């Protein structure tokens, strides 16, 4: 009933494509403390490529990394082409989701002044040079909650331009370890980014 | 606000068992940002095993790791099996604590739908309760605030079962380094977890 | 919103001294969720020592680390002697700043009970033993948002005593890598600390 938490469900049914359709349950919770967004996120791949990682028999790089994209329009609606199905992605209602799909959700989108879409011109003066890293959180999650099973995790904001998105949260994942029969089950990751809002 | 912050005191007197009774000050602050909980946490061992770590003379594993449990009931009261003494664990009032002990504190407990108590072992076709990792935050703290002194730190939610707990915040700590005369003084760690609600009315 | 979020601008003009004057844009956002402060922070060095790090030709330590201080008075005003210029450091209003400079900002300062001014200890009684680490967050940021480019990052609270400061947020940065032509462009870092104010 609180309008201040866009999320999946806390315990979601398969609602995310990783390597196929409905590959994986992605738990993502955006709580809007002031002008910033507090977010935790776990990923669990239940079937397909990364449901039981083995790089002993699959040493290839395509088997040692993947990416999850959330694509949003100017209203901040989740698009098709997002890795995340939008059926069970809405504002909170007890442990579940609100009856109607959400019309507007800009307050929750990354700031397009803080995290601008990169531009396609070559010239750039000292003060007018924009940043790639600014739009980035690089960290680790840990498969199975084992500290010896690190995945390099890269949250990116308004990185994507897919399906004519205006805002884009992107979780990239990669590892060096040659994991043997290790389900991709990520530890919860806490992070924040600066939001947008607009009047009318 | 004061009613939105369960914690110890900012500067607590020895209030945590690590290897023996009140042998460490644990600073923990739960602030309830919407449906999530924002938390920072430092640990300082003042006496006993880990008050001055040396693995040169104590190479044994029992001397290179330990765990601190907070056990809660369905109301969210701290239970006896807890590593943390409950005298100075309550809602905030200035840099101190509220007059009466707290009756209810569920809003602050980890979500038992997101972090369910029981774990399923063996088979995994559905795999629907099958996340161990979801209930986990793995990171590092740094003894003395020195970047060369990492402790592998594992926050767990509703992991524990002891004393008939319903909710359980659990901080495990372990290290590979052979530390020589290094007090266990952890750098403050920021983290969040998904909370619980309170029925309807 | 106003009074709830002390910050720079989301996209700041050069407003930070690192090795010389206004040689870097530092983006810092303090949002006061309850009794804690939520903060993200990116640093971008546009000119001078760290604008294009090379430790192949500059192996010296002075070229492999630096520190950024914010020094505050009892009111919580940013002082000269801070690395951060105070012109465009104020309470939020849209993507910009409030008209007048801010009179009071204690609610945003680190807790002087949790992070005491104490640093010299003459005795050390078991129950009255004070903590250095408590005042510390040690983590990593990642230059260019590349996971292979770690900087050891140390946030410290009420560490500093310079210019007779009462409160002090301090970001130290250091690296072991011998980086070749690597701009100091940090990935956004999320963190929190304890903060109070009270009076009549
Ligand atoms: C950083 C962290 O938290 N975990 C790390 C663990 C633990 O420190 C501990 O050694 C496990 O027992 O060590 C590694 O496996 C290692 O040294 O190769 C890297 C891993 O990232
Ligand atoms: C905060 C952090 O990650 N610190 C890490 C440092 C940094 O790389 C630092 O710059 C140089 O010590 O490296 C280690 O000391 C190391 O390799 O053994 C481990 C430690 O966890
Ligand atoms: C986010 C993270 O973990 N970064 C770390 C990377 C990643 O493992 C990366 O994927 C491989 O470059 O490893 C190091 O570069 C390394 O091994 O020396 C240290 C660095 O801090």
Residue numbers in the entry:
A (entry chain C), C (entry chain A): 183 to 382
B (entry chain B): 183 to 383
Give sentences copied directly from the paper behind this entry.
Each protein forms key interactions to promote cell infection, with the terminal domain of the fiber, the fiber knob protein, interacting with the viruses’ primary cell entry receptor. The adenovirus fiber knob protein is known to have a highly conserved trimeric structure. Sialic acid (SA) usage has been proposed as a cell infection mechanism for EKC causing HAdV-D. Here we highlight an important role for SA engagement by many HAdV-D. We provide apo state crystal structures of 7 previously undetermined HAdV-D fiber-knob proteins, and structures of HAdV-D25, D29, D30 and D53 fiber-knob proteins in complex with SA.
HAdV-D15, D24 and D32 were crystallised in only their apo states, whereas HAdV-D25, D29, D30 and D53 crystals were also soaked with sialic acid. To evaluate the potential for these recombinant fiber knob proteins to bind cellular sialic acid residues, crystals of the fiber-knob proteins were also soaked with sialic acid prior to data collection. The conformation of the bound sialic acid was found to be a mixture of the α and β anomers, freely exchangeable in solution and minimal protein side chain adjustment was required to accommodate either conformation. Whilst the threonine was not found to be universally conserved, the other species D adenoviruses had similar sized residues which generally made interactions with sialic acid in HAdV-D29, D30 and D53.
